[PDB]
Amino acid sequence: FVPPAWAPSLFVPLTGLVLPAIGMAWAFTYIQKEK
Amino acid sequence: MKDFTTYLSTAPVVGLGWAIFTSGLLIEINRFFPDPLVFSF
Amino acid sequence: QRAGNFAPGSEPKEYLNDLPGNFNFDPLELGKEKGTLQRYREAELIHCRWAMLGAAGCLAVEVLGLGNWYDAPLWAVTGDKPTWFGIEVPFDIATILGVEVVAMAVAEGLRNDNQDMEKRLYPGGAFDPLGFSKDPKSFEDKKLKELKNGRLAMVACLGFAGQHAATGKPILEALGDHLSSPFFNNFATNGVSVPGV
Amino acid sequence: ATKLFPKFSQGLAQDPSTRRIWYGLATAHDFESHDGMTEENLYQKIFASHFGQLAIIFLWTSGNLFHVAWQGNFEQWVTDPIHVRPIAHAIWDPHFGQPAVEAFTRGGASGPVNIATSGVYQWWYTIGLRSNQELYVSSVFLALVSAVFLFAGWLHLQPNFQPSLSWFKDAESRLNHHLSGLFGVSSLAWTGHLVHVAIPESRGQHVGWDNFLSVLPHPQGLTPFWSGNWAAYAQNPDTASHAFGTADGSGTAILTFLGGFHPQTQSLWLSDMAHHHLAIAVLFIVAGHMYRTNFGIGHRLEAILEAHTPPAGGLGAGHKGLFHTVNNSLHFQLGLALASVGTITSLVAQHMYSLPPYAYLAVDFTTQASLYTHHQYIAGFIMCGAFAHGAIFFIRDYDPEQNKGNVLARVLDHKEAIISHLSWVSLFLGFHTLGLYVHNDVVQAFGTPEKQILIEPVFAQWIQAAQGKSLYGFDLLLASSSSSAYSAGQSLWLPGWLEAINNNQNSLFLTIGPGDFLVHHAIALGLHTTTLILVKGALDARGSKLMPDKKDFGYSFPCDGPGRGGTCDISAYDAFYLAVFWMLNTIGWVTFYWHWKHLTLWQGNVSQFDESSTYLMGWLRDYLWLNSSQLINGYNPFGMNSLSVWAWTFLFGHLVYATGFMFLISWRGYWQELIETLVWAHEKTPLANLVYWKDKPVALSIVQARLVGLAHFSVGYIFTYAAFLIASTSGRFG
Amino acid sequence: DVAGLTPCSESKAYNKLERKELKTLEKRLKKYEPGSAPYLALQATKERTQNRFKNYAKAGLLCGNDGLPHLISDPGLALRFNHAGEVFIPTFGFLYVAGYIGHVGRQYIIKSKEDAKPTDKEIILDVPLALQLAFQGWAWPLAAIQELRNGSLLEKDENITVSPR
Amino acid sequence: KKKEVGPKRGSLVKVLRPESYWYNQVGKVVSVDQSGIRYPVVVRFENQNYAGVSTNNYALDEVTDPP
Amino acid sequence: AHVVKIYDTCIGCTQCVRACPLDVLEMVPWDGCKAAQMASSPRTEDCVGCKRCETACPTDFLSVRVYLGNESTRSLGLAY
Ligand code: CLA
Ligand code: CLA
Ligand code: CLA
Ligand code: CLA
Ligand code: CLA
Ligand SMILES: CC(/C=C/C=C(C)/C=C/[C@@]12O[C@]1(C)C[C@@H](O)CC2(C)C)=C\C=C\C=C(C)\C=C\C=C(C)\C=C\[C@@]12O[C@]1(C)C[C@@H](O)CC2(C)C
Ligand code: SF4
């Protein structure tokens, strides 16, 4: 139902730092993937 | 004379002559008919 | 075979030669194709007959003193008693609308399923009980007379429509107004037909 | 070489450069140019992509519902839809300072929140949503729908579930089903929901899924529908003194023709919209079974296309051969769909502000301005997309031997005449509009403004007088009772519509003056010029005199070199990319006109717009300078007000505009030589040459440079105008 | 009294604008001695302003809610309210002059092509020929419609340079 | 051989080649090659193209009379 | 790399080969032209697509055509 009060303190750093970082890591490994 | 006339017969010179002629005509018309907007004879 | 000219000395049409009611005409060169020509022929004949009947109704509703043709369907705005020469028929608007739609639909279906190009313009047979069309010359001159009276019928119907769109006076009142005061009262005195008179 | 990232392009895989990344993204969903691609595989990829876009749309609106319910004030806005502002989403930014946190606490919230301008509050209040739990369950249901659609796309992508080629090419059955089911029964179910929920909720009666199948929407109880007495539904409409939230002044009517606006909320009646959607559903269903399915009845598209040929060679072969042209070429269908949808959203933008369909939407000025601007910009973008994909159709899939002598072959035959006439009308409109504006500015500058030329827009005024506006006078229809238009419908919708159109407070047929006339002609100039550019790109797409073989070079190629005098920006893609600039200018003009006229209407100084829109000093000073005072004062050394974010994104938009200028003015040779010098610098340095690049750094392509400059230009344009519009409309209103 | 607008003579905002202009001209005039050239220049400007405001009135011009005169463009409506001289007559005059320009240019283009190096005649104009065609363009619509009648105004699609499809 | 494989030299011709710059244009025949090459008709044009040239070689089937 | 295509409208004037800055074209014997020469592209893998050969073509339209696509190290003009 209603999310807890610490949800803006967790999801915003997750989708602002951690999720873009792992996305760029996966994309960097995919760009330079060789045979 | 004819070489100078052909120089005056070039496109920029006759364009300049048209420019002074049209500008002077419109300016004298505006001066002797001060600020008209609607054709009323 | 040409019955006259809409302009004496105009350009003759090479395709509009073997035509009933040959009066040259066609300045816009419409119906040069033969199929379009015969389609225009049958359409003009149908419009002729319908304008014939419409002019008949408009004149007969007025010469008998029964009311305006434009005020004739005025019983159907909210529901009233219709009549035909004092017959006071009790027919609802839905019933007459449905039966008229059905009858006209099946009549148009039969006319479209005629499938005879000569008979589409002029069927004959059961539609000619008196049988005066057996003589070919009489048939030709009666075709010309029908076309002329039908053209007069459509221009008269257009005149009625325009007159009632301009002025509220009926047909007989307009005729009396033109007869009594033609110069002082005509189509130029309407003020709406010509923007500026 | 031959990396695995561009799996859809073997040639791009063997590219040892950074461009392989960029061309690996721009050509990502151009499946027609991919290696080893069949038509069936292309159709399956299109189906999967469509399901993906549907899932993304449903997830996005689910997120909007969830972020309105959680961290929002939907119930407080329901109680008082006039004073308190809607909340879009809460702000959690650790970079925020304490004065910035305190300044962003608006609408009675416990933290920093953003004032909602999308207008979903008014829409969800109009459709019957009242509680936050309803928004929560709607959001979770839409999330489930999005997950279902994504799984459906995955399953239809899987083997032994992929549709056949003839299944996709079955145009008649698709047309019949989408006309009858996607539009007919969808609208029927929507108006059923309207009747069941929204009218009782607007009349103070709660209708939910728990009490569903128990409360009768009409007290008669469906018996007039079976008895044919449909007029009994329009028996007791809501009174003028009716409250939207309560049952005061309520009635018993679900379908009526009460044309006009609700006096309390300045919006269209719910019963009127329900009747409209019911009639639309009936018209769609009765027209949704016209085409020839497997049954013996219906209409064949090809038969009607081939039979509709004018006689005597009016259009040559006529419309023959267009069925295979539409079916085989998907870009033709894409262009037709984008053009129709663009016209639809243009109509939506032009009809929302004049006829607000949502309760308490006209009072929310910033919401209406943002909605109109967004819809107009989307409309222009997909107008341009329709024309660009039409050019793509002309380049890629267009066989003149198939459609020989048809309408397409004819318009390709005399394309020079069409382009020349459009160029002439563009020159005519631009010359005279600029001459009039400069004349007015010079006349107003000389201190004698009465010498300016003010051509009265008599045509639009005559139309509005013919449609009920009695301000201009005249004696046309809907103004004189003797007219048949006045007599017809005198007791159906005329008394409400005349009252709505004779009021100057609402945006229904506002007063149009000479400045409105001039800006309308400017709009016409913009539309005609953008049309000229786009049809010149589309008609000269497959060939021209400078490049007869333009079809062999594809749709997006840079140039042919400096030969033949110079051949840069000769592709139809470049024509589209210039038309993007012209479309941006045109939508900027229409949005400037809308914003200034509506702002002067809301401030009550309509005379300021009437005497100030004539000359461009008024446009620059009374609109772009007077209304920007609150925007620029968002943050300053004195302090900060609530419009600090709008000032920041305004400067942000100006910055992205400048970066667009960077990527559009300078071209590839200078940056390539500079990149070579930087490559030498990285190669010949200690302590840094140990690392190396896997792909050689190269300058961006000329087409890529045009795309990047266009993207930066459009992003800066959109952000700048959105910032200015929202800051000007919300900084002084509410 | 069309379009819900009042005539300039009957309007109040027109007179208010004229009064404001006369007031600011008099304020500028009061800073100069009567025996100075700027005084005569400002007096001439005030006289021209008064003459223009008198000529704009009693000429059919009408203004709405701001004192700035408005122009009616629809023919017929301008004909029945004496507003044809606003735009209707000037548009016909401009069409006449534009047709004069087009006919003179067409005559110079055609008449300078049946000779060696027509580009030389294009770049160095034959001034007597140009003046002769200038004074022969007074009957441009007659010659234009006659060239349309004989078909020399338009070129056939077989001799016209055309782009590939 | 008999007569000549092409038109008379110095006579005006109209180019029927659609991809040429001088489509539906009048040019002058300079010389016609008789060896049997694909485009023997050398045509000189009064107006130059974008490349600045004024001569081109055309085949026998793409030249007609000036209409 | 790029695709260089030469048609039969070439007159064998050898201007395209002289204008080539990477030695892509060549002259082969021919019988379809007066000069008995025909342009060829046996080294199209070294062509960068500079379109210098198209500038030097004297014939109307183009007797030699360069089509870009599938850029490589040699085709991108890279010294690195
Ligand atoms: C009563 C007489 C009559 C009239 C008035 C027409 C008139 C027409 N019929 Mg026709 N028709 C007739 C008899 C008639 N027909 C007959 C006897 C038959 C045999 C049964 C047909 C069978 C027939 C068929 C089967 C079809 C027509 C169609 C048409 C239309 C197109 C004709 C055409 O070639 O384009 C006119 C000629 C041109 C060369 C077109 C030029 C168009 C220009 C270039 C466009 C200019 C646009 C411009 C930018 C606009 C500026 C405005 C600005 C505000 C933007 C036209 C309205 C077609 C249709 O439905 O189209 C609506 C069609 O498919 N007719
Ligand atoms: C606000 C800036 C601006 C202006 C005024 C123009 C003006 C013009 N562009 Mg546009 N354009 C611009 C920016 C601008 N462009 C940008 C940024 C782009 C994106 C790259 C484009 C992309 C673009 C395309 C793709 C096309 C145009 C076209 C046109 C013409 C439209 C015809 C018209 O409206 O009548 C003319 C109106 C004008 C305002 C032109 C200016 C003329 C005034 C009156 C001055 C004339 C000289 C004056 C008498 C002074 C003389 C002395 C002086 C020379 C010293 C016109 C020449 C179209 C075209 O060529 O028409 C066929 C076209 O296809 N432009
Ligand atoms: C119904 C919608 C629709 C559909 C299905 C398509 C589908 C297609 N179009 Mg079309 N198009 C559309 C709408 C549509 N388009 C619209 C609205 C426009 C006008 C803008 C265009 C303009 C257009 C052009 C000009 C071209 C296509 C092309 C293509 C193809 C390439 C797509 C692909 O796989 O690459 C995927 C492509 C990308 C991922 C690139 C997208 C990059 C965007 C611009 C970045 C977003 C901007 C910005 C940075 C976002 C951040 C904002 C910031 C504030 C944070 C494909 C056939 C191309 C084609 O057929 O190739 C020859 C082509 O040349 N289209
Ligand atoms: C240093 C100068 C400078 C520059 C280069 C820019 C650059 C920009 N500003 Mg900014 N601006 C600046 C300083 C500057 N700014 C300052 C100091 C202020 C005061 C605070 C503003 C106030 C401001 C506002 C209020 C707006 C901008 C906008 C813009 C953008 C221009 C939009 C565009 O190209 O549309 C092309 C231009 C137009 C479409 C219209 C031009 C304006 C005219 C006068 C309106 C009248 C047009 C009307 C239809 C009649 C004309 C018809 C025609 C035929 C004659 C761009 C990001 C706008 C934006 O973000 O995008 C819309 C915007 O709304 N700026
Ligand atoms: C007198 C020669 C002449 C003539 C008869 C035409 C005729 C035409 N042009 Mg062209 N034009 C000309 C010169 C001419 N043009 C020049 C010099 C230019 C370069 C500026 C153009 C640029 C041009 C464009 C860009 C367009 C036209 C278009 C048109 C058509 C619309 C009519 C019109 O007013 O367009 C408007 C024309 C102009 C605004 C150009 C006016 C240029 C100057 C002011 C006139 C020069 C007069 C000349 C000095 C007289 C010489 C007389 C001699 C004795 C010295 C029409 C076929 C349009 C079209 O395709 O319509 C289908 C179109 O889009 N023209
Ligand atoms: C059928 C018709 C009228 C039908 C009337 C009916 C049913 C009337 C019925 C009723 O009235 C009654 C009895 C009583 C009322 O209470 C009720 C109603 C119901 C109202 C009119 C046709 C009317 C037909 C008309 C007016 C035709 C006009 C044709 C024109 C102008 C032709 C133009 C061209 O000739 C040019 C100019 C140049 C050439 O190149 C080209 C062409 C095309 C040939
Ligand atoms: S786009 Fe660049 S390389 Fe091509 S013609 Fe233009 S300047 Fe030359």
Tell me if G55 sits within 8 A of G16, measured CB to CB: no
Is D4 in contact with A12 (Cβ distance < 8 A)?
A: no
User: Which among D663, D656, D648 has a CA at the least distance from the CA of D715?
Assistant: D656
- Chain C touched by D312 (CB under 8 Å): yes
Is D312 in contact with C35 (Cβ distance < 8 A)?
A: no
Ligand 6 atom closest to the CA of C26, numbered from 1: 40
- Chain E touched by D513 (CB under 8 Å): yes
Backbone φ, ψ for residue C183 (5° rounding): -75, -40
Q: What angle do CA D34, D37, D41 make, to 5 degrees?
A: 120
Q: Enumerate residues 6+ apart whose C-beta is below 8 A from E72.
A: D456, D458, E2, E3, E78, E81, E83, E86, E87
Distance D531 CA to ligand 2 centre (A): 15
Question: CA of A24, closest CA in chain D: separation in Å?
Answer: 13
Only one residue has tokens 């018996």, namely: D223
> Could you write out the DSSP letters of every residue in D411-479?
HHHTHHHHHHHHHHHHHHHHHHHHHHHHHHHHHHHTT-GGGS--EE-HHHHHHHHHTT--SS----TTT
d(CA F41, CA F13): 10
Question: CA of D540, closest CA in chain E: separation in Å?
Answer: 8
Select from D428, D591, D592, D625 the residue to mutate for testing ligand 4; criterion: most ligand atoms less than 8 Å from CB. D592
Q: Which of residues 32-71 of E touch B (CB under 8 A)?
A: 48, 51-52, 55-56, 59-61, 69, 71
Q: Enumerate residues 6+ apart whose C-beta is below 8 A from C129.
A: none
Q: Is B7 helix (H, G, I), strand (E, B) or coil?
A: helix
Nearest residue CA, atom 37 of ligand 5? D424
Backbone φ, ψ for residue A4 (5° rounding): -70, 165
Tell me if D236 sits within 8 A of D222, measured CB to CB: no
Q: Enumerate residues 6+ apart whose C-beta is below 8 A from D724.
A: D627, D628, D631, D646, D650
Ligand 6 atom closest to the CA of C28, numbered from 1: 40
User: Which among D594, D601, D593 has a CA at the least distance from the CA of D733?
Assistant: D601
d(CA C171, CA C69): 9
Q: Which residues sit opposite E124 in a β-bridge?
A: B10
Select from D593, D617, D629, D657 the residue to mutate for testing ligand 4; criterion: most ligand atoms less than 8 Å from CB. D657
Distance D613 CA to ligand 4 centre (A): 15
Provide, for chain E, the percentages of residues in helix, strand and coil under a 3-state DSSP scheme, each rounded to the nearest 5.
55, 5, 40
Amino acid residing at D546? L
Tell me if D472 sits within 8 A of D457, measured CB to CB: no
Give the other-Cβ count within 10 Å of D697's Cβ: 15
Q: Is D298 helix (H, G, I), strand (E, B) or coil?
A: coil
**What residues does ligand 1 touch, defined as CB less than 6 Å away?**
C 36, 39; D 308-311, 314-315
User: Which among D132, D118, D58 has a CA at the least distance from the CA of D358?
Assistant: D118
Tell me if D698 sits within 8 A of D672, measured CB to CB: yes
Chain mean position to CA D81: 27
Element (H, E) at F43: strand F41-44
Nearest residue CA, atom 6 of ligand 7? D568
Q: How many CB pairs under 8 A join C and D?
A: 6
Ligand 7 pocket, residue D701 CB under 6 Å: no
Provide, for chain G, the percentages of residues in helix, strand and coil under a 3-state DSSP scheme, each rounded to the nearest 5.
15, 20, 65
Nearest residue CA, atom 44 of ligand 3? D711
User: Which among F50, F38, F16 has a CA at the least distance from the CA of G62?
Assistant: F50
Q: Which residues sit opposite G64 in a β-bridge?
A: G6
| Both tokens assigned to D716 | 């800066």
| Both tokens assigned to D703 | 């087409």
Considering every ligand atom shown, identify the ligand nearest to the alpha carbon of residue D342 and give its number.
Answer: 3
Tell me if A4 sits within 8 A of D71, measured CB to CB: no
Tell me if D135 sits within 8 A of D124, measured CB to CB: yes
Q: Is E139 helix (H, G, I), strand (E, B) or coil?
A: coil
Tell me if D126 sits within 8 A of D358, measured CB to CB: yes
Half-sphere exposure of D73 (CA within 13 A, CB side): 23
Residues in chain D: 734
Half-sphere exposure of E129 (CA within 13 A, CB side): 13
Only one residue has tokens 């563009």, namely: D426
| Both tokens assigned to D417 | 């005449």
Nearest residue CA, atom 58 of ligand 5? D424
d(CA G41, CA G23): 9
Q: What angle do CA C73, C75, C80 make, to 5 degrees?
A: 150
Ligand 3 pocket, residue D25 CB under 6 Å: yes
User: Is the sign of the CA dihedral E18, E21, E26, E29 positive or negative?
Assistant: negative
Name the strands in the sheet holding D455-456, side by side, starting at the edge strand that comes first in the sequence: D455-456, E69-72, E62-63, E6-7
Element (H, E) at G40: strand G37-40
Tell me if D537 sits within 8 A of D546, measured CB to CB: no
d(CA D681, CA D662): 24
Ligand 2 atom closest to the CA of D435, numbered from 1: 44
d(CA D309, CA D465): 40
CA distances from G9 to D153, F27, F35, G23 (A): 52, 19, 16, 21
Ligand 7 pocket, residue D669 CB under 6 Å: no
Chain mean position to CA E30: 37
Chain mean position to CA C87: 26
Element (H, E) at A10: helix A7-13
Only one residue has tokens 């929302």, namely: D352
Domain count, chain B: 1
CA distances from D13 to A34, B14, D133, D704, G3 (A): 10, 63, 51, 18, 18
| For helices D572-603 and D365-396, angle between their N-to-C axes, nearest 10 degrees | 160
User: Which among G30, G38, G40, G31 has a CA at the least distance from the CA of G13?
Assistant: G38
d(CA F58, CA F60): 7
Distance D720 CA to ligand 4 centre (A): 9
* Euclidean distance between the first and the last CA atom of chain C, given in angstroms as a whole number: 43
Half-sphere exposure of D190 (CA within 13 A, CB side): 19
What CATH number does the domain containing B32 carry?
1.20.5.510
* Euclidean distance between the first and the last CA atom of chain G, given in angstroms as a whole number: 18
For testing contact with chain B, the best of E43, E124, E131 (most B CBs within 10 A): E124
Ligand 3 pocket, residue D711 CB under 6 Å: yes
Q: Enumerate residues 6+ apart whose C-beta is below 8 A from E25.
A: E42, E45, E46, E49
User: Is the sign of the CA dihedral D708, D712, D718, D722 positive or negative?
Assistant: positive
Is residue D323 exposed (0-12), middle (13-18) or buried (19+ Cβ within 10 Å)?
middle
Considering every ligand atom shown, identify the ligand nearest to the alpha carbon of residue D441 and give its number.
Answer: 4
Give the other-Cβ count within 10 Å of D186's Cβ: 15
Strands G64-67 and G3-6: antiparallel
CA distances from D454 to D457, D582, D593, E61, E116 (A): 9, 27, 17, 11, 52
| Both tokens assigned to D606 | 């309509």
Backbone φ, ψ for residue D115 (5° rounding): -75, 120
Q: Enumerate residues 6+ apart whose C-beta is below 8 A from E165.
A: D400, D412, D413, D415, D542, D543, F18
Containing domain of residue B29, as a range?
A: 1-41
Tell me if B11 sits within 8 A of E35, measured CB to CB: no
Q: Which residues sit opposite E63 in a β-bridge?
A: E6, E69
Ligand 4 atom closest to the CA of D719, numbered from 1: 60
Which among G61, G65, G70 has the least Cβ separation from residue D11? G70
Chains touching chain F, criterion 3+ CB pairs below 8 Å: D, E, G
Give the start-end residues of each E strand in D149-307.
none
Give the other-Cβ count within 10 Å of E75's Cβ: 13
Give resolution in angstroms.
2.8
Is G80 in contact with D552 (Cβ distance < 8 A)?
A: no
- Chain B touched by D442 (CB under 8 Å): no
Give the other-Cβ count within 10 Å of F31's Cβ: 14
3-state secondary structure D665-709: HCCHHHHHHHHHHHHHHHHCCCCCCCCCCCCECCCCCHHHHHHHH
User: Is the sign of the CA dihedral D641, D643, D645, D647 positive or negative?
Assistant: negative
